[PDB]
Amino acid sequence: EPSPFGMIQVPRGSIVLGNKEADSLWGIPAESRPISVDAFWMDRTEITNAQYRQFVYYVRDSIIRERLADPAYGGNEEYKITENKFGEPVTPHLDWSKPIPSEKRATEEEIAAINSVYYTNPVTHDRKLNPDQMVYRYEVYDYRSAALREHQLKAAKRNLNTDIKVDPNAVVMISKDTAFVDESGNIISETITRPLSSEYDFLNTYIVPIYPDETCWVNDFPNARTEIYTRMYFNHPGYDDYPVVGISWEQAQAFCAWRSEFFRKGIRLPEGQIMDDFRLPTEAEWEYAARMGDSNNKYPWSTEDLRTGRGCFLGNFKPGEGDYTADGHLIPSRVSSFSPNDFGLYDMAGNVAEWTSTAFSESGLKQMSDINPELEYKAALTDPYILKQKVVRGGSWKDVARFIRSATRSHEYQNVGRSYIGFRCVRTSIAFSSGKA
Amino acid sequence: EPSPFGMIQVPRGSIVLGNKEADSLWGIPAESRPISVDAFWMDRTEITNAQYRQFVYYVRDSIIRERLADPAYGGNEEYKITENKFGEPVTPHLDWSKPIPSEKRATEEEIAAINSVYYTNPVTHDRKLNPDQMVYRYEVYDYRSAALREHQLKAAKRNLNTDIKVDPNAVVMISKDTAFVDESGNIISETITRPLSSEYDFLNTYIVPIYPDETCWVNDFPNARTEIYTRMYFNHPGYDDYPVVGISWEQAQAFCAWRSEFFRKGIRLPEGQIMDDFRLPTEAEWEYAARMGDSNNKYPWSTEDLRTGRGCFLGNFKPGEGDYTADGHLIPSRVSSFSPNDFGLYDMAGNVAEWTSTAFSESGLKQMSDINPELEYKAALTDPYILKQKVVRGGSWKDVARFIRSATRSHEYQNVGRSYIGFRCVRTSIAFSSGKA
């Protein structure tokens, strides 16, 4: 079995998915409805700085590979040209079996190509990766919207009710967002509302910068000093087993897509065929994996209190008023620091709040289905900023015990990336469990 | 004795065929009337993805056989031409003793003919079977309507009451639906209302696409993610012992006809002569085979409760509100998973609701006969969509315990195929049981 490393197979089950009683002081309705979910693989630890650093190393590698591949910036022309071994004129997108670029010794053109994406500080003389030139380009296929009845290719197949004759000139409007790159280098993302004509109307290409917003440590924390945080939270070698923060939702999707690509490239297996890839966890999936699929589990630990028998704290949230370090940690602590739930998920409620796929609508629970429910809203460009609000769940280090309870929805804008928003890459498990419970 | 594999010989008997007491909350009359049925062979397991995959493999085989048989697409001209061995000028419909087409190595024309019915994704580069070119063509004979008094060939034989003289110019209207194929490839199904002139007026030819509607997993489940279901429910090699879903009623009839054809071709037996073929089970036949032919059996298990002594659940229905997996399975589970009834029928009430031949009329029970009753309505083209409503029975995974009770009629359109509608192929048994009960 594949059984990806760092994953945990959470089985299928059901959860009440909410809280019945409502905090009158908070003044919320506290709406809930039961929901059942299937089995899937969830990574035990929030994606740390090490994994996202591997992702940015990969994207930097191919970025400079492409730059050196340009004839104007080195012209190595490795690629793969016609008559590849057994006369194969394959498309030369990029070559990755070429010798690794060598630091120190190189030609002037190769050094220039490598430094084209690096950034040196005029006043500090520190060289790092360019935030606006660390861009990841990927493609996703809208499988769910491609199989819809009204979105079928043949017009006569769009309505199975034979009472009304199908008009061949059906006016149906499709959506597609495919950020394309221009000659000036200013990556422009556009939406297209052309009428449904072919299968290409169901593939979305996304090119997005993926370097984390370190400045998040400063923008949302005024009148506080975080120089020791925004400077090298990512860059510190010792900050490897700590969850990454500042990731935008778009960058979260990009990284999950990259993880899917890496899984597909490695471990060649024709038997997998259409085997499922990685994605962000859904709201219902996340909550079910959190509360153990038990109604009585307010938090992702067996007991109902946030203190153990000896008074120790579980999860590095904010215990008391202005008491961020009462549990023992101030900033997002290292992963697997506290005692995990027996489901196998570390820091399930705590550390950094989690990105989740389903778009927040304040209807939410009472508007999705009952089997693997989720809301999909790939809002594009000229939409109100309110609709671009992906929901988040988990409770972070800054949030009080009220927000550490798993059954608490919270707003989040997909564009922004804050210093308290981690994320997980989750995959769907095709498991033939015999049941027999 | 033939005794087909995977079949169970349910004997003759009688059933109350309904429920006397009515749920006042549901507000239904709950009408019932006793009905007796004969013995027949019913397949213990719902027809799985493996069997329908065998059917689609067969239809794909002869499809490409015909395409390669065309002179323009390979011109192999195997067929069977005049002077067959002992000078037999038989009709060359198709040759099936020819060497199997070989993958990888072939001529260009053969590869083109094979790929003429395959479909490759422009954006995904995945090759599968074309849903609109996996068409099965068969013929059925309306034996019941051919033997009717008013439908007899001779006019003088249409009325045995000699008081009124028979008019030779009798104006009787017949019905016949024979989808014919055109040069453009757009298969057109038509109905003909020509006056009764010959025996051909009683044979119905049907050409229908048979590839299951995988998109059913998406169309009837909005605001839920089923990418892991519609993508490879059929295509996954591990999903072999799971019942097939999304089958339209027309495709159900086509597959049962194909099973009859396979049974006729194999096991050469001139003694069979007019031995009965496969069909869909009737409403009364299905219910009698479900409730064991016992009035007190509300469900197809001996006890009246849905839980065993240890609390285990029988049948993968929806036990609780939003609790699809309380029994242990979320989607249609594998066949024979639960304890079968002693009649020998697996998942009798549960898993996927069953296609049945009798057309729903909301009169139903109080409008059919008492011996092997069933309603036949082969509605054709220009009819209201309401009349094209084949009844279904069994209760599916999504339906609550109320619909898992066998004595519950439910609507279903013959054209549509949902993710919760399986079916069975049932045959009539000519059994000379001595009785002596």
Add this chain to the structure above:
Amino acid sequence: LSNRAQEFNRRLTQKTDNAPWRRVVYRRVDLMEESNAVLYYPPRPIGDRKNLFSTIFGLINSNSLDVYEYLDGFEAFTDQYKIKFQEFLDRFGIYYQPSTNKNAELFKVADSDIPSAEVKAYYVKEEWYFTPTNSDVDIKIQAICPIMTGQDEFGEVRNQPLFWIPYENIRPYIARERVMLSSLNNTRNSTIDDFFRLNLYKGDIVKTENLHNRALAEYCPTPDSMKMESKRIDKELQGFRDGLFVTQDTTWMK
């Protein structure tokens, strides 16, 4: 309308001409009961929320329906014995004001002119008939009355039977309208044809086709006499059905 539809309908008819039982019984059923109360809808069409009286009135107004009249004691269904719409309107002095459509209709429906709201009971003629082939007791409906249950000073029913609707003629115009049936479900899943065919008009028997051609009124004038006679007829038909039972002593207990 379609050829297959006509074939199915013909195969659906109950061919009762040679059966050793043809008990024709007349039943008055009260709409006050929840079962029969599907006939208390607003007279106006307003889409599809109509009772029986409204649609029969609409059909007879357009001359697309053939119907017969009453006889005050007898029920003769003859071609020459045809109800005249002039006699229908002069029953309560309804004006004519002929319409310009002519072919479509001759009299315009004057909104609430039809007494749909004040009809409170239905007369039905049901023929319980044996079958010479499958030996199942069944019922065949052929005639009904929307009895004009008026309200005079003393509250008497003061019934004036408008006319006699043959079920075979109205069946095509009832098999399409599929109004809601039971209040606790409020679902549009059963047609009114299903309501009649399924024998849900639970009421009380007024009189059978006796040799004396009498009625329950000839008995004791007290209403309890009507109730006891209706229950007597009901249990006598139930006993007729029970007389074919050959499945006694199935307890198997010692």
Add this chain to the structure above:
Amino acid sequence: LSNRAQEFNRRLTQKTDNAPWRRVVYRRVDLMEESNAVLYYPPRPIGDRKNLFSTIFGLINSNSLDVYEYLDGFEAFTDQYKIKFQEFLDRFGIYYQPSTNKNAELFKVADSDIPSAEVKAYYVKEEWYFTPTNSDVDIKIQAICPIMTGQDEFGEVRNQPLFWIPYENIRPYIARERVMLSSLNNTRNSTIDDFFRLNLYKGDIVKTENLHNRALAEYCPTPDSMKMESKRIDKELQGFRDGLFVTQDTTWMK
């Protein structure tokens, strides 16, 4: 407005046409209760602090909304049955003084001319419907009334129902306004569309779509009869939901 927004909205609609439950129930909900009291805002726009009546009035005034009228016992939603703003204004003698804008609107909002302050209850039509796919009991809102709860000499409600607002038509003009919900939070985080969709209009049932087309007033005139009938309907729907429970005896105690 955007194509993706329209696609999401279409995917968000509750397609209820074939469901074996369509119980339509009419509920009167009192704004005096803290739950429903989101409808006691000043009539003037003053930015976004508006109640329902104010925004419906503003939308119908500009002729950007299509709405229907009352029927005093029945509820027929027909295209020809359209409420006329002349009938709206003559209900209380509101002057015309037509504006020069014309296309923008024909009648100027006369500040406190709308009776936003004196409306104290809401009528709602909610259709509890089963689902043929996921078997979850749900609700679909289609119609409401801002009943004119006037104050006469004896304090009677003296209701004059102004008109019938279809929810589908007002939904686009409600999904944007996101007024505050609960006083103990005073946060602008939920739209009024979320208020209706989440079933927070806790009130009492006035009458269902019964076969007799009756109301709770036909019962005992005492208000306790209304309370007991409303609670009876509520527990009957609760029992309908409970009838699908198959999870009994989960205590596992000895």
